[PDB]
Amino acid sequence: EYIENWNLQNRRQRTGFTFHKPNIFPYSASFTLNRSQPAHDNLMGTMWLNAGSEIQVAGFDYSCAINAPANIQQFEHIVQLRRVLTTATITLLPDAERFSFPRVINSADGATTWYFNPVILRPNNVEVEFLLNGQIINTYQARFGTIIARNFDTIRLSFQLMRPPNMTPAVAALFPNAQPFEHHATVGLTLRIESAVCESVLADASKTMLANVTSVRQEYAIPVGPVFPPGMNWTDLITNYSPSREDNLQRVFTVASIRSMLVK
Amino acid sequence: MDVLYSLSKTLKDARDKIVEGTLYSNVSDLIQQFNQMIITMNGNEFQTGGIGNLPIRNWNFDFGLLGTTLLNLDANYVETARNTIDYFVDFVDNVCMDEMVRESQRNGIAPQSDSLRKLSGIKFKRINFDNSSEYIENWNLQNRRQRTGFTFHKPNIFPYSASFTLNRSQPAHDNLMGTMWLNAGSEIQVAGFDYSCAINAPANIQQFEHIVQLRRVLTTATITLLPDAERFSFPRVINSADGATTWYFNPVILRPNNVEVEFLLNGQIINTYQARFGTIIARNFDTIRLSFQLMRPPNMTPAVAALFPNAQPFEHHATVGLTLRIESAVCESVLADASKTMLANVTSVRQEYAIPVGPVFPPGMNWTDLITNYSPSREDNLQRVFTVASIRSMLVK
Amino acid sequence: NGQIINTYQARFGTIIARNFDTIRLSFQLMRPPNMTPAVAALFPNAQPFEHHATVGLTLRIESAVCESVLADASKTMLANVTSVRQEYAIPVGPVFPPGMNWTDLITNYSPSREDNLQRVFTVASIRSMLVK
Amino acid sequence: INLPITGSMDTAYANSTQEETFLTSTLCLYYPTEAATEINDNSWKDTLSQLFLTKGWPTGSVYFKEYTDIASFSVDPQLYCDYNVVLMKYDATLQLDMSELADLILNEWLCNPMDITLYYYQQTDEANKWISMGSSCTIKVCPLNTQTLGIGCLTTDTATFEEVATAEKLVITDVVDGVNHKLDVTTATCTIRNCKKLGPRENVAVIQVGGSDVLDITADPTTAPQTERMMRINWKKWWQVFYTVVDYVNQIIQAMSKRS
Amino acid sequence: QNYGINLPITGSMDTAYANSTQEETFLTSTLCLYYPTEAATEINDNSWKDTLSQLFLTKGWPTGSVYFKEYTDIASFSVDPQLYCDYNVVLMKYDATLQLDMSELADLILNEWLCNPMDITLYYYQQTDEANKWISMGSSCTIKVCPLNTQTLGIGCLTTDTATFEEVATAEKLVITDVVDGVNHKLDVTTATCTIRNCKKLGPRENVAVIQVGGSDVLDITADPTTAPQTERMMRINWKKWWQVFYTVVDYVNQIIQAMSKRSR
Amino acid sequence: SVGSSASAWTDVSTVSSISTQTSTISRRLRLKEMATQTEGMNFDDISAAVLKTKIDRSTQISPNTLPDIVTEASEKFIPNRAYRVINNDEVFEAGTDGRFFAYRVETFDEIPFDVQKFADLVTDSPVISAIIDFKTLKNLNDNYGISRQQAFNLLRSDPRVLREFINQDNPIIRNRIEQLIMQCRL
Ligand SMILES: *[C@@H]1O[C@H](CO)[C@@H](O)[C@H](O)[C@H]1NC(C)=O
Ligand SMILES: *[C@@H]1O[C@H](CO)[C@@H](O)[C@H](O)[C@H]1NC(C)=O
Ligand SMILES: [Ca+2]
Ligand SMILES: [Ca+2]
Ligand SMILES: [Ca+2]
């Protein structure tokens, strides 16, 4: 595959590398508060972990959308990939897990901390849009499970938190009309890119090319060069995936595959 | 179809083997096969398209063979072979795209995309080179009926079902007992919850059972069975059976005692595992029966005794979970996976060329509603389109 | 790519840039310490502030050399292409936006777009070599 | 409902049953005579009804039922409405009496009769209790041993018994569960019933007008709970209390659920 | 330095925790205790304020940062309070007969109110949500209200005969009135002695902290009867003297300032 | 600490995180100057020189106000400054303003910045002042292209080569120096 795509590139043609659980998302674990306070007691925002092949996002409102119009609060998460993907098989589920239990987080400036006691609800009016150059390509309304994306450099996950109009006593005793708000309503989404295809080269959970490269460099104590970052950390190497880095990465991955064909 | 796979495989091996400087001793057979392919194609006129946005293309073949005089290959040969291969490549690609978009209940195995009905004739039998791939092998085996099999990594055999079942309910939803489950792709995460923690039940035990009934039998499945299902172990606000009201769910996770997994095949037990967690095996199974027990801890500390009182308020609800992933498996029929792209190729071709919904496949080819009713017509059409998709992928990634 | 190539401090007129993907302009507004009556009447220490102080900069790329294809103020390839499309009422394709608005076409200059654009520009030059 | 209900989680939440359940239901307030006294008005019921008519409740759905005192209310309470609200004055002198009233109305009891002069009764579980109502109950008990003789009491001399109740209009008696008791009661004035405590009555809402939360519904001294339909207010007038009830009736009716 | 705009913020989770802003916020802030005259009476001293300040100096609070502001009675304090410091602590004596009064005081100071005025003689007012209450301060407020119907006639009251109105407050120094929301009321008020204002309750005030020195916690901040909550800045002590109470406040001031946070507004 | 030791310096007490760590670490390097842990022009030297020049050419300077001016100067001269460390032909710069450039000695060419190495070097290895900081250094190596010895001595911030350029009237050094003065205004 690697040498075939090398030859194709030299004789320019539509290449493709097939990947299983590709590591295209750099590790980013961060929040964003569209309604903040010093005491951090009535908040609205979105938290996200984007790592490897997985995106776990969660929009939290502490007031359960009581003062919002139509008893509804919007949430949108835009992801921009550094390389186009095609024929991607995606597993989309609700109720993100790592942002669905109690938590103590810092503020933006890191000075103080705030608490987050979640109560998981379901996304309503959910809409997943896989776009390409700002134009929309694939759209999915309230479809959960195994879905497809044929060409996309951008993802738009737009969901909503809808206050349950009819509530039992035990749940009505959690979302009051006043500020204390000891239970914070959340709406989550997990999205895993199981398979994918890419014009360019990446890393996976299936192949050892990057491991071979990094191991060689760590073993023989190679100094840092003008292209690759120190230790070849995939985060800093995908966040800036410039053509020179892409070329050198394709080259070293090809020769690493060559070396693995003989000495694994 | 076999001839289509042969075309694809020899064009692949020609883009690979026929390069500058190589040695005719290594490509004599490929070259004789190429020349025979040419000799058999030349004289025929094919048509492709006529459904959706597929452009109606006409293919006319009149090429010249590849000489056998040289010893080492030069650029004046590689170039002619490349100009002869690109045409066949886009031809095979357009044929596979015209074949992934047609359906039938009447003889779904029978070739559609009439260019392929033409390549299925007897004069095109000379093109067969080797039917080695797993899909084409299983195809030939199904035609010459024999025990087939595909090897899947993390197969998508479970349709998405995220649902509950309450065996004790009240309009206030304050003393409940039931089981919740998320069956998706290759995983089953089940959780039996009692609000009382089995204070009134006999012997301080509460039974839970979850039965799954697969639509296609599996074999030599490697499974990972863990406790404490993650996604039914945090506070939740769930709906009611009819969508009228909502109820709260504040779980506190206990461990399954007397856990028992049974893998069955047409009601006959096959594999039984008692209190074994981690990696397990299932040699043949069409049904799974998980059965566990919520067991009240008789000896309790104050910090926990203060959670499970003897009266109704019950602000903490005892839970017992189980996660079950199918890491690998072997199946006589064709499914979707996490490693292979054929389903995505099919769905992407259809989303691109705007194919109307046919009488067989659901709208948008949603795997959930496609595996929920896995009729033999759907299975045949799915095997056909997945086979030609693999074929297409062997050329154009 | 965040790496620095050229820097110019307090230079004006004609300047050069051998390779770059990013521009960073940094200037200052410095209150005049010595101030005549007229200017002091415009810059008081009070909030009304009827005259707002500005500091400007113009920067024009008169010439350049790019590994990829673009448009200019000299060559008519984009004009030939867009004129052909507008004349023969071509539907909107899966790649180029409607009307080939260069703003929406350069704002997202993905390699597929770059390839198709090089192709159409090349045939447009081939055509203008015969009929301008 | 002990049947195998099944559902899903992708189903959409439907529109609000409120503003239809209000039309197809009824509400009943239970206020003390001190309220009408301090008010000194006659059309205050029609006033409150015309007010509830804004919040949605129609005219013939709201009802008011006066009661002179907590004990005269605890004497055979008859709560038959699709939604019940009970405003309750706080009094340390009436702490146990109003906690018994709470444990009686808020919870659902299955009450069998009891014949004392012919049978000897016992408790089985921690939910079996003996509730006595009437003008003035004087209850004495003698626990018995294996051989139907008394422990620290004589089966004949009633003066040897243990006095658990002394002129209470309502009593709820819990004794040691697993022993046979012989009782002496004033059956002419007070009737006693062997009741089993079932799940809670989700139709009534108690509102402690005054002091801190003291109601210990549960007889076991470990829970000490405070449910959703047990409210507290601080008061200096009654018009403000009724206006608060009116303005926040929908929360009360979200905390209660539709007994039918 | 934008003002009056609410912008999305952003951060991360791999950012480390900074240092303890205590021992600097003390120096750069101010603290104000509000004690009742019974405390000073029982103490029977005149150097106790300087003593407490010299004690605080060992906790980090400098000399000219702490202030003690006396109030004779709960109701007198309730009459037009003005809490203007950077950290306020209030020591509230318990009294069953003052329960609603010292609940209204708490609901007034703990929370932050956006207040507009009221001209009874001209307009007929109504509440829109569960937060638009009517707070009346003064020496002796005697309030009466008549709700009106669609055609601006009275409901069980006569717009002319003031005596037919429904008295909800009798000679109180502070009243917080919530009435039925969605109807037009007409009021009678002793405006010569009491001023009433239509105030919408905003989010809480994190600058003040009430401390019930005596009995059980009774304060019902939320006017609605269902919730009846208890916040972090609503504390409780049991007392037999006052020196012990002030020593306790001093020794656990850092816990109090952790329970409190400077005002957003 | 960032890694590989915490002696005292690598204490991140608190844009990118590398920038923040480098600023937090470089605001301590102001104390390396008054430890004999320097090799070059030792920026506080320039601060003191400017102070002497001003208190000698001023008229309003009283013996009562020179105290607390010798402190305000030392504290508010060059608040945003930069330092560098050299290790086997690899130079790692850093500044309190959150900038960080890694490059080579002979052919000035940026390189990815290596935290967990810059820290272990700035701990022990001698640290040097950034009077000739990478931006101006590269502007100079391009426009006024410089020799190996002069480049090494500009790295070490040597007065000989510095004054040589300042007498040859090199505006890429004159402007940086005048910037330093106008930052030593007070
Ligand atoms: C629910 O309310 C929405 C908005 O008012 C309306 O469009 C819809 O028809 C309603 N549905 C029902 C079942 O009442
Ligand atoms: C960090 O906090 C500790 C604990 O209060 C303190 O001892 C230390 O001095 C602080 N760090 C600095 C740089 O002040
Ligand atoms: Ca009683
Ligand atoms: Ca009992
Ligand atoms: Ca006795």
Ligand SMILES: [Ca+2]
């Ligand atoms: Ca009052």
Ligand SMILES: [Ca+2]
């Ligand atoms: Ca109100």
Ligand SMILES: [Ca+2]
């Ligand atoms: Ca009246």
